[PDB]
């Protein structure tokens, strides 16, 4: 669980003699930074 997700299709690699070049993609774990609330007060009945 050190990474949230990764696209297995997106790995590209090229090799040329003694040299290789790599590219890939990772979905990092997303945060949850903001929370908004809408708090309302209403009348109420209680009865015998």
């Amino acid at each position: 669980n050190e990474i949230q997700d990764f696209p297995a299709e997106d790995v590209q690699v090229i090799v040329e003699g003694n040299e290789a070049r790599i590219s890939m993609t990772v979905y990092p774990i997303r945060s949850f930074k903001k929370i908004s609330v809408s708090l309302v007060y209403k009348q109420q009945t209680l009865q015998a």
């Binding site: 009348q43 109420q44 009945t45 209680l46 009865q47 015998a48």
Partner: protein
């Protein structure tokens, strides 16, 4: 004290005494209370037109003492002539101070709220009978428990019961109101029939059994 009754189609004066007091024998003293001439109950109103005040006919009221006051000569004399003034005398007459009925119901549990008024002409207003009771109850209820200069432990703690409108406070208010109302011996019982809440507003109603 007494019970009310009305003359029914071709009911004889014997029949009434027998049904309420058991023995028919008592009708004889019972006619003196209703001040009746010999035709004690008579069917026709154009026959009541003979001398209206000394008779009863179909649809007219009658007075029925309790058996203890049946034999009292003073009860006989008073019931003979007073007639409808019975109820008023029996539940009382006093000055009317409900001058501003719209107003006292805007500031209860505060002082200075009631005031004399004038009805008729040149005389302070007075209240009688059932309205005598509506006045005294409404005032008494809106008076704090130790604030009359004599005979304290009169009134209510209604000024003290303001709280978070949770139901225990509402039952407490109910009980105080019932105690308040049942204090006067003239009222038999009270009971709640509704309690209801509107945020910061209480509402409810009470039924009281007043003696006949």
């Amino acid at each position: 004290r007494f019970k009310k009754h009305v003359v029914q189609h071709e009911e004889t004066m014997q029949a009434i005494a027998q049904r309420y007091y058991g023995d028919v024998s008592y009708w004889i003293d019972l006619v003196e209370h209703n001040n009746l001439k010999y035709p004690y109950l008579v069917e026709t109103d154009e026959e009541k037109m003979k001398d209206p005040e000394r008779l009863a006919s179909t649809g007219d009221t009658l007075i029925i003492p309790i058996e203890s006051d049946l034999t009292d000569v003073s009860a006989k004399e008073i019931n003979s002539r007073d007639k409808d003034v019975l109820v008023e005398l029996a539940l009382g007459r006093d000055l009317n101070i409900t001058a501003d009925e719209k107003y006292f119901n805007e500031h209860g549990t505060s002082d200075n709220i009631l005031a004399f008024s004038t009805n008729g002409n040149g005389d302070l207003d007075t209240v009688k009978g059932i309205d005598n009771m509506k006045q005294q109850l409404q005032a008494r209820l809106l008076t704090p428990r130790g604030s009359l200069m004599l005979h304290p432990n009169y009134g209510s703690d209604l000024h003290n019961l303001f709280g978070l409108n949770i139901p225990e406070q509402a039952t407490l208010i109910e009980m105080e109101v019932l105690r308040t109302l049942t204090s006067d011996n003239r009222v038999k019982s009270a009971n709640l029939i509704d309690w209801k809440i509107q945020g910061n507003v209480y509402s409810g109603q009470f039924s009281v059994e007043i003696k006949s």
